[PDB]
Amino acid sequence: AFAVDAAKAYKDYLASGGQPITNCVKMLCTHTGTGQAITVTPEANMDQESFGGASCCLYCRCHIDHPNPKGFCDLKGKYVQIPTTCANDPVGFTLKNTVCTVCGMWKGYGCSCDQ
Amino acid sequence: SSQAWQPGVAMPNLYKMQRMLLEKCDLQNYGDSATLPKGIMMNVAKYTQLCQYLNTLTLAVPYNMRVIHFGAGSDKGVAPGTAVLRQWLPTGTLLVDSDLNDFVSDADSTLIGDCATVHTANKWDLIISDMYDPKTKNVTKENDSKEGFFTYICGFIQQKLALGGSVAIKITEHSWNADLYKLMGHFAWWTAFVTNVNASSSEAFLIGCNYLGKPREQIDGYVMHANYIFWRNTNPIQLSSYSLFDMSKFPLKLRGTAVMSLKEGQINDMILSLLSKGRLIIRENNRVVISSDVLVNN
Ligand SMILES: Nc1ncnc2c1ncn2[C@@H]1O[C@H](CSCCc2c[nH]nn2)[C@@H](O)[C@H]1O
Ligand SMILES: [Zn+2]
Ligand SMILES: [Zn+2]
């Protein structure tokens, strides 16, 4: 029944004032992209930074198993768009937020679907 | 220096034709640094400028392109160069990377170990290497041709680079190899390319464009490295980040270059011309299979 809960541990270390994970790989891009959350090439709009996906994944960075039956990572090999105001902590952002399944934008950071 | 808006500077052809003696590299702009855009890593900027320059060459770009990237790890445990390569290459390109030390990567597959342990069943369309041993920077010793990973790279090109394929292999004043320069004469064209963001360093990428599998020209590698240093010593390059701010035409164009299986007796001058123009890749199109040898001890 025991499982390491790294997501909870990182959220708690953040709340206690720990420095966010560094060296997430920020890409050069036009910043005129669709703004969707996780894409096959950088898609940052004017309000976002694009990062290499693997470097923004808590499980990739900590060298631990991904929390699903198949061990799959949906960031590695892709690019993640992070709101510029949140780009000091891309790992925390991807961990605390959810991608809207119909429009592909971050819930509360671009998703228009419930207006 | 209208060079400041280019991604970098390629070695002018007349410098390649000299017979210079090897001298110490003494860069005027040594110790200067370019102003990188806010939050951008040197190695992201460097690979972006390398790829911007490769966009100007006649690279073969087939469907299901195969690219391998050596020296892709960083002391940060991530792979910035791999992330730029995956941004640059057409979606669906198979990208494999590798490094002596463990790292987290966006590549389709990653091998950890000395590159000499890496074997692949298939051939490759593009080989990128950033491998580098900082212990070669000993200014107090004779600067001879280095072997180590360069010996592996030379054999890997000869055995596993598809005809028509290309390479970009990082060198510096002290990290270089004469056979690798000699191998540049086995491509339709070659250069030594210096990124504008890192122009204060003696590093360059040795680029072989469109592999022909035979010597097109005979190059003495000790002379050519001396020529490269002479060029760098007499041609200060202004550090520049300018090209990083225009990414609108960054992605490598999917040319759909033809891929053919051909036996060596069928590579005629007509085929050699197509290869030389970036219009043909010669290799099988089977599955891509890689491995790393593991030494088992107590
Ligand atoms: N014999 C060898 N076999 C495999 N790997 C090797 C070997 N000798 C050196 N190396 C590796 O070359 C890298 C140079 S620094 C790259 C930084 C980077 C690249 N792309 N983005 N950032 C180091 O990581 C280093 O371990
Ligand atoms: Zn992951
Ligand atoms: Zn939505």
Curated annotation (Swiss-Prot), chain A:
Residues reported to bind Zn(2+) 8? 100, 103, 111, 113
Q: Which residues form the ExoN/MTase coactivator domain?
A: 1-115
Q: Which residues bind Zn(2+) 7?
A: 57, 60, 66, 73
Where does it live in the cell?
Host cytoplasm, Host perinuclear region; Host cytoplasm; Host endoplasmic reticulum
- What the protein does? Plays a pivotal role in viral transcription by stimulating both nsp14 3'-5' exoribonuclease and nsp16 2'-O-methyltransferase activities. Therefore plays an essential role in viral mRNAs cap methylation.
**Subunit record text:** Forms a dodecamer and interacts with nsp14 and nsp16; these interactions enhance nsp14 and nsp16 enzymatic activities.
* Name this polypeptide is given: Non-structural protein 10
Q: Whose protein is this, by species?
A: Severe acute respiratory syndrome coronavirus 2
From Swiss-Prot, chain B:
Q: Which domain of life is it from?
A: Viruses
Subcellular location(s) of the protein: Host nucleus; Host cytoplasm
Q: Where does the Nidovirus-type SAM-dependent 2'-O-MTase domain start and stop, copy by copy?
A: 2-296
Please list the residue ranges covered by the LRR repeats: 19-43
Reaction catalysed by this chain? a 5'-end (N(7)-methyl 5'-triphosphoguanosine)-ribonucleoside in mRNA + S-adenosyl-L-methionine = a 5'-end (N(7)-methyl 5'-triphosphoguanosine)-(2'-O-methyl-ribonucleoside) in mRNA + S-adenosyl-L-homocysteine + H(+)
Residues in coiled coil: none
Question: Catalytic residues?
Answer: 46, 130, 170, 203
Q: What is the documented function of this protein? A: Methyltransferase that mediates mRNA cap 2'-O-ribose methylation to the 5'-cap structure of viral mRNAs. N7-methyl guanosine cap is a prerequisite for binding of nsp16. Therefore, it plays an essential role in cap methylation of viral mRNAs, which is essential to evade the immune system, especially when restricted by human IFIT1 and IFIT3. May disrupt host mRNA splicing in nucleus by interacting with pre-mRNA Recognition Domains of the U1 and U2 snRNAs.
Complex and partners: Interacts with nsp10.
Q: What is this protein called?
A: 2'-O-methyltransferase nsp16
